[PDB]
């Protein structure tokens, strides 16, 4: 019985024996009759080392016993500050509750564990969580006479409120500086606001709520190229966030100025405008259709003939983000004449613009049979098939994306792919060392098998059956499943955005 | 020690003491120093009753001693025919061998136990099993002068082939009578042969090998309508068999005579000829193409407008069987103008003819998008949609078959199906008590979801999502999985014979 041995060893403190039993096959999450794991016991007794060891071997940090107790509950009661620290660092439920609504914070407050109270609050313990008796950690600290803990909680709350108020004050001051007649003052506030907005979506909403969006849009018309670049940077950053925040940027009226700047003669201003547009287009179909209605596609397609490879790369980035989502948007991109430039860029020696044109074409081919047939008519398939032999694994994955999306179409498009000689290289890749490339090639073949009898027969003639059958012994069961589905098909979309 | 007592009782013959000691806790398979169980001893001494008792109490019938001898070895040695029979009936190893490769058959033959040799050979004893000296049971029978046993072994080897030859003689006599100048002899032979052919595929091959096919094809030109009808019956029966046997019937040159008899004024001859043709066309694409090349389709299509409903049914049956298999054959059926007549017969008052026309249209729609579009242009979809609300469950399953096959086509055909108003009625049927009808309608909805985004939108607007999610809890797990697959899709031909 390795489970009982592991439970007892963890409870006693035999680190070496715990390691041995786990190495020998002892279930690291073995529980006794009440749901207490060796991790519960280690946290309870105070065996920090065994806690770490068990967590390293796959112990569930939030395992609930029959009463709903977690190892963190136990650590918070006992007063093992270090174990509380480790468990919280390993993902312990700081606000996890038992059957009577007692959370580790309640325990720490009942017994006056000041250190653990502070740690739990710092790791996200809700100070106001009530238990089955309507008692908060502060309530229990007061009822048990722990003035220290109650004042500590009050102090944490006061510091939190003070920091919130100071942060709001500074952000409002920055939004005010944005309208300054002093150049350096406003330029500094611009840069710092951009920095805040680049910390993630949470910071972005702070800036937006302070009211920086309209001020930034106003600066977009400035004649000071330094100021203008700084404003564009801040806008692109805040548009890197959620789709609601992108829509806020759009409502502020940024798109007209941006599409205007697309015709800018200053390469840095133009790069910043393209960045902003692309981050905007990473949103939903509504934001993308807004970008289209602003008249951006003509200028982007025009910029596809740019000699500056960074501007070209960014224009391809934007076109891809717009070609994501709906078929009306993809058709808009097609109507603007982007496909010729994209197929041309498929033969570019620059691998980055190559991957970008591939990403754009894969997105365009994710649409309907109309858009896929337009990709085919533009002559994309020769180059895509040629790219199947690439040793560059990411470019190969890109070409496979595009080919499986083209093969998601009707029998006519699947026949266009087969006539392009894609099957030998696909069956070959089917035995590739890289599992993601194998999966992509298998998806492609599977969407090919979904055609008529002509296409299924062609796949058979290309020698796919043997390798598909061999894949049944693949260690990865997902590949087994997809290959079996393909076999049954013979014997009878996916879009990507980047910010 | 109850085990030793049981051994002693079994060897002595104390039946009552054997049973008693077994009741007192004696192990029925107690082995002594040599590996001999009470069953070994009972078989060796000749205590049939004790053998039965021990085997009924769980005695291992194939227990081996230190030399590999089983109780069957011992019984075959001693000559206890009855004990050998009982042991074999309880699963004794007829080909079990000892350490020197001696099997019970070796023993029975060495000692001239004729009865036991017969029993062992009938139970699968290897006549060619050798022992460590290179001696077969027949070899030992000869070396010890048991000529009787050698003749018995030769007879076991011969008898099966001898009976095969007797059957061949009888079949040759019948095939010869097939060329008799007297009517009655020929009629008797015909009927007896037909019955043989209706006994199953082995009998069919026996008849074919006897050379009956050419005589039957010759008789198809007879002026005695009784003889002709019996010949057609016999050919139909043998064409109910395997596809190689159907191809034998075809090679013998039967199809032209059948196609001629199709214009016969004898309705019973015509019914038998159509039955034979449908059985032939039930085979593979080679047989169906043979039937097509014989020029049968014009007469079948013509018979679709027949007043005799039995003849109409059989013509639809043949056309359906042709419409199975390959798309070349389905196209042949389309070119013969069968789709108009089938679309007409969809409004037939005869429910059987309605199921038959549905089955035909379904097989036609299982092919490629060309054939499905031809079905659509014939105006089938209004009639199929109307039939979706039919209170007849089998006709409904057939209509759903046809619709799920038509919806297997391209996005254009799925849109034609949607335009015919099938979606409300399909969603409605999705709430049917009948699990098979539910599953068929579910297949239909799923093939609609397998189209483009427009079709998925149409399905969503029809209120499919609610019932589809409800179906995730359906008792039938296959239906649960099919409904889940349909949900994921939205958020991104049979043959018949007669004897």
Topology:
Two copies of one chain form a homodimer.
Chain A: H1 2-12, H2 15-23, H3 38-45, H4 48-56, H5 71-78, H6 81-89, H7 104-110, H8 114-122, H9 137-143, H10 147-177, H11 183-197, H12 201-210, H13 212-219, H14 225-239, H15 243-251, H16 254-261, H17 267-281, H18 285-293, H19 296-303, H20 309-323, H21 327-335, H22 338-345, H23 351-365, H24 369-377, H25 381-386, H26 393-406, H27 411-419, H28 422-429, H29 435-449, H30 453-461, H31 464-470, H32 477-490
Helix pairs in contact in A: 1-2, 1-3, 2-4, 3-4, 3-5, 5-6, 5-7, 6-8, 7-8, 7-9, 8-10, 9-10, 10-11, 11-14, 13-14, 14-17, 16-17, 17-20, 19-20, 20-23, 22-23, 23-26, 26-29, 28-29, 29-32
Description:
2 copies of one chain form a homodimer. By secondary structure, the first copy, chain A, is mostly helical. Helices cover 69% and strands 0% of the residues of chain A. Chain A has 32 helices and no strands. Chain A has helices spanning 2-12, 15-23, 38-45, 48-56, 71-78, 81-89, 104-110, 114-122, 137-143, 147-177, 183-197, 201-210, 212-219, 225-239, 243-251, 254-261, 267-281, 285-293, 296-303, 309-323, 327-335, 338-345, 351-365, 369-377, 381-386, 393-406, 411-419, 422-429, 435-449, 453-461, 464-470, 477-490. In chain A, helix 7 (104-110) runs antiparallel to helix 8 (114-122), helix 7 packs parallel to helix 9 (137-143) and helix 23 (351-365) packs parallel to helix 26. Chain A starts with a helix and ends in a 9-residue tail after the last helix. The A-B interface holds A 327, 368-369, 410-411, 452-454, 493 and B 326-327, 368-369, 410-411, 452-454, 492.
């Amino acid at each position: 019985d390795l489970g009982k041995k592991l439970l007892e060893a963890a409870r006693a403190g035999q680190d070496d024996e715990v390691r041995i039993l786990l190495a020998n096959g002892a279930d690291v999450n073995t529980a006794d009759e009440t749901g207490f794991t060796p991790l519960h016991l280690a946290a309870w007794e105070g065996h920090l080392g065994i806690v770490e060891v068990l967590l390293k071997n796959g112990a569930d940090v939030n395992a609930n016993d029959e009463r709903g107790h977690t190892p963190l509950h136990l650590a918070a009661y006992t007063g093992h500050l270090e174990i509380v620290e480790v468990l919280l660092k390993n993902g312990a439920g700081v606000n996890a509750t038992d059957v009577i609504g007692t959370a580790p914070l309640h325990l720490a407050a009942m017994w006056g564990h000041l250190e653990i109270v502070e740690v739990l609050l710092k790791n996200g313990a809700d100070p106001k969580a009530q238990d089955k008796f309507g008692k908060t950690p502060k309530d229990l600290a007061k009822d048990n006479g722990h003035e220290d803990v109650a004042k500590l909680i009050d102090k944490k709350a006061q510091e939190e409120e003070e920091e919130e108020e100071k942060k709001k004050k500074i952000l409002k001051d920055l939004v005010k500086k944005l309208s300054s007649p002093n150049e350096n003052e406003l330029q500094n506030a611009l840069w710092t606001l951009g920095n805040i907005a680049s910390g993630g979506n949470e910071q972005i909403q702070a800036v937006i709520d302070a009211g920086a969006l309209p001020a930034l849009v106003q600066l977009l018309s400035s004649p000071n190229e330094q100021i203008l670049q700084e404003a564009l940077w801040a806008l692109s950053n805040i548009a890197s966030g959620g789709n609601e925040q992108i829509q806020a940027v759009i409502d502020a009226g940024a798109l007209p100025a941006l599409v205007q700047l697309l015709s800018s003669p200053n390469e840095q201003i133009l790069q910043e405008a393209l960045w902003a547009l692309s981050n905007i287009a990473s949103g939903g179909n509504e934001q993308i259709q807004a970008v289209i209605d602003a008249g951006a596609l003509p200028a982007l397609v025009q910029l596809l003939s740019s000699p500056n490879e960074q501007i070209l790369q960014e224009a391809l980035w934007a076109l891809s983000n717009i070609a994501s989502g709906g078929n009306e948007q993809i058709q808009a991109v097609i109507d603007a004449g982007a496909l010729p430039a994209l197929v041309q860029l498929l033969s570019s020696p620059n691998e980055q613009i190559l991957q970008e044109a591939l990403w754009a074409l894969s997105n365009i081919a994710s649409g309907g049979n109309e858009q896929i047939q337009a990709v085919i008519d533009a002559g994309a398939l020769p180059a895509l098939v040629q790219l199947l032999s690439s040793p560059n694994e990411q470019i190969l994955q890109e070409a496979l994306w595009a080919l499986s999306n083209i093969a998601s179409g009707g029998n006519e498009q699947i026949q266009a792919v087969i006539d392009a000689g894609a099957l030998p290289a696909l069956v070959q890749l089917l035995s590739s060392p890289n599992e993601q490339i194998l999966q992509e090639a298998l998806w492609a073949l599977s969407n090919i098998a979904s055609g008529g009898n002509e296409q299924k027969q062609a796949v058979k003639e290309a020698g796919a059956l043997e390798k598909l059958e061999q894949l049944q012994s693949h260690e990865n069961e997902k590949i087994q499943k997809e290959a079996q589905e393909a076999l049954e098909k013979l014997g009878s979309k996916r879009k990507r955005k980047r910010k």
